[PDB]
Amino acid sequence: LKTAVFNAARDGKLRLLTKLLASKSKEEVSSLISEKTNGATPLLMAARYGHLDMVEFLLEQCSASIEVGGSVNFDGETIEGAPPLWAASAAGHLKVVQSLLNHGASVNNTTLTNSTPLRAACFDGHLEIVKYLVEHKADLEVSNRHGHTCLMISCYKGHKEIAQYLLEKGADVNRKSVKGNTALHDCAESGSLDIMKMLLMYCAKMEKDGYGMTPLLSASVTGHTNIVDFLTHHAQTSKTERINALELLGATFVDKKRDLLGALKYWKKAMNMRYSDRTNIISKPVPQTLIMAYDYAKEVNSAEELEGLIADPDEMRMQALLIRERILGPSHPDTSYYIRYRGAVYADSGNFKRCINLWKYALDMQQSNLDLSFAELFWDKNLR
């Protein structure tokens, strides 16, 4: 019967439920209401699926599970510890949110990952819920267990109106997550140029994160040329930051975009800057040794060495690997990742020796730089 009660509440079948409940006691209803059916409770399941009248009914009986967190499903994932207010917020149910709050639900109660209802509404961009939680004293600066903020997830998701509202309400634009991520990096990674300019209206400062990435280098890693174009013309980036960002973006064009002509265009820009001031030429750093996995290649160091690259796609592919290891280094996950992808392409074309040398090298890199495997192929930020 406790299972019939939950399934009735979960699906908003309020007629059925009131029959099963009218024949019973008042003290025994509060018990069947608070039953952990499949990790959830009736109120939580009803709030998660928007059945406004059901939850208004469940609370008229026993308003005593209103803060109990449980299990809800979103996008085929399972969220642990989510109170009802959080689930109504995550799923966009404005009036269930308004109701739960009128019944005294705690606007700050979180999931097990310390996600607030406000963060949940920011994730899928429910602007009107965001405004209501904030007008009802949501704390803008409570972040999840990784230190990722409502502002950061708004920037990462591309929600311009939400990010703007949060900033008008005094959200701190310069917060840093545990890994050193600022909202400016979320903008760089999502290609959200409008939001990035909005953050710079508040003097958001460009910083390195834990990978040593500025937001400019984040946009080069992820391939968003609108951010790279904007930030390489911004006075807060130095000449050499710009050169490296353009060379890295070229490498991204080779390995991620499979666009060799795009790659060459950014490598020429960068090579121009390297030689623009003849009194202070900025030539390529020199690595410790040549590398067998990279076919012993060497980065081009002159405009002339560049023009004789397009007809040699295989030279460009080694240029990209060298560029990425120089600028990102062995600890960034993309370095070993694109070494393995490069080996995979050589394998598919029958060059198994080249493949194996690349894969041996990427494995050595991972193991000698310790605190996306082949099996798994066969991240934090997307947490609600």
Backbone interruptions in the chain following residues (C to N > 2.5 Å)? 371, 378
Half-sphere CA count of 250, side-chain side, radius 13 A: 29
- Tokens found for residue 308: 């004789």
What are all long-range contacts of 294-299, with beta carbons under 8 Å and residues at least 24 apart? 294/318, 294/321, 294/322, 295/354, 297/322, 298/322, 299/323, 299/326
Category of 50 on φ-ψ map: left (φ > 0), alpha (ψ -120 to 50) or beta: left
Residues 6+ positions from 149 with CB-CB distance below 8 Å: 119, 140, 141, 143, 171, 172, 175, 177, 183
Q: In 3-state terms, what secondary structure has residue 82? A: strand
**The tokens 């080069």 sit on which residue?**
220
Q: Which residues pair with 70 in a beta bridge?
A: 82
Are 362 and 292 in contact by the 8 Å Cβ rule? The answer is no
The amino acid present at 274, given as its one-letter code, is R
135 vs 309: CA distance, rounded Å: 58
110 vs 85: CA distance, rounded Å: 9
**Structure's resolution in angstroms:** 2.4
252 vs 324: CA distance, rounded Å: 8
Q: Which residues pair with 72 in a beta bridge?
A: 79
Residues 6+ positions from 25 with CB-CB distance below 8 Å: none
Could you give all domains of the chain from N- to C-terminal order, each with its CATH number?
A: 1-134 (1.25.40.20), 140-224 (1.25.40.20)
Residues 6+ positions from 366 with CB-CB distance below 8 Å: 336
87 vs 42: CA distance, rounded Å: 13
Handedness of CA 273, 274, 276, 277 (dihedral sign): positive
105 vs 88: CA distance, rounded Å: 12
The amino acid present at 90, given as its one-letter code, is A
Residues 6+ positions from 190 with CB-CB distance below 8 Å: 155, 156, 157, 158, 224
Distances (CA, A) of 303 to 53, 269, 270: 70, 10, 10
Q: What is the DSSP string of 248-295?
A: HHHHHHHHTS--HHHHHHHHHHHHHHHHHSTTS--PPP--SS--GGGT
Beta strands in the chain (DSSP E): 70-74, 77-82
How is residue 206 annotated by DSSP? P
158 vs 263: CA distance, rounded Å: 26
228 vs 287: CA distance, rounded Å: 26
Q: At what angle do helices 352-367 and 333-348 cross, to 10 degrees?
A: 160
54 vs 9: CA distance, rounded Å: 7
- Tokens found for residue 83: 């109170």
Provide the pairing of β-strand 70-74 with 77-82.
antiparallel
Buried b (16+ CB within 10 A) or exposed e, 367-383: eeeeeeeeeeeeeebeb
Q: What is the dihedral of CA 61, 66, 70, 74, to 10 degrees?
A: 100
In degrees, to the nearest 5, what angle opens at C-alpha 103 toward C-alphas 100 and 108? 60
The amino acid present at 148, given as its one-letter code, is H
Closest residue by Cα to residue 250 from 297, 192, 189, 309: 309
Are 7 and 40 in contact by the 8 Å Cβ rule? The answer is no
In degrees, to the nearest 5, what angle opens at C-alpha 295 toward C-alphas 291 and 297? 75
φ and ψ at residue 71, rounded to 5 degrees: -105, 125
**The tokens 């803060």 sit on which residue?**
67
117 vs 124: CA distance, rounded Å: 12
CA–chain centroid gap for 197, Å, is: 19
- Tokens found for residue 167: 């900033």
Neighbours of 14 (CB within 10 A): 17
φ and ψ at residue 237, rounded to 5 degrees: -115, 135
- Tokens found for residue 47: 């709030």
354 vs 330: CA distance, rounded Å: 20
Distances (CA, A) of 102 to 13, 66, 105, 361: 23, 12, 7, 60
Closest residue by Cα to residue 141 from 132, 131, 152: 152
Mark out the alpha helices in 23-108 (DSSP H runs): 29-33, 42-48, 52-61, 84-90, 94-102
252 vs 222: CA distance, rounded Å: 7
How is residue 380 annotated by DSSP? G
